[PDB]
């Protein structure tokens, strides 16, 4: 799974992660993807660890959106439009080829999962 900007491959952080295929400048757009949005309670349990949420709504990012791993020291950030219809991943610093691209899931994601170890 890849495009001109990134590639998906095994990550040292866990499972699969998104990596830079080319160098990125600070503030450059890494990925823009559409999201499927529905009330929080309509998602079952399958995607509990993947979904993004705002208030009573949750969104499942398509494209590479749901594959980005988390880091306490991320090199990218994510934002979702009103209605959570689209998500954008922007770098917050220069990223070199081969470097994993990470975002911040937010504290509660991890605090609510004490059995899971954060890398």
């Amino acid at each position: 799974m890849f495009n001109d900007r990134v590639i998906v491959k095994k990550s040292p952080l866990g499972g699969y992660g998104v990596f830079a295929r080319k160098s990125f400048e600070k503030g450059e757009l890494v990925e823009e993807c559409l999201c499927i949005v529905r009330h929080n309670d309509d998602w079952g349990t399958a995607l509990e660890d993947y979904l993004f949420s705002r208030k009573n709504m949750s969104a499942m990012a398509l494209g590479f959106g749901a594959i980005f791993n988390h880091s306490k020291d991320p090199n990218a950030r994510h934002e979702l439009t009103a209605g959570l219809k689209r998500m954008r991943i922007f770098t917050i610093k220069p990223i070199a080829i081969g470097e994993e691209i990470t975002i911040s899931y937010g504290d509660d994601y991890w605090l609510s999962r004490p059995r899971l170890t954060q890398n």
Binding site: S53, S58, R77, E79, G106, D108, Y109, S112
Partner: peptide, 8 residues
């Protein structure tokens, strides 16, 4: 808790 969703 699910992931945060920062506003634009």
């Amino acid at each position: 808790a699910r992931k945060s969703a920062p506003a634009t």
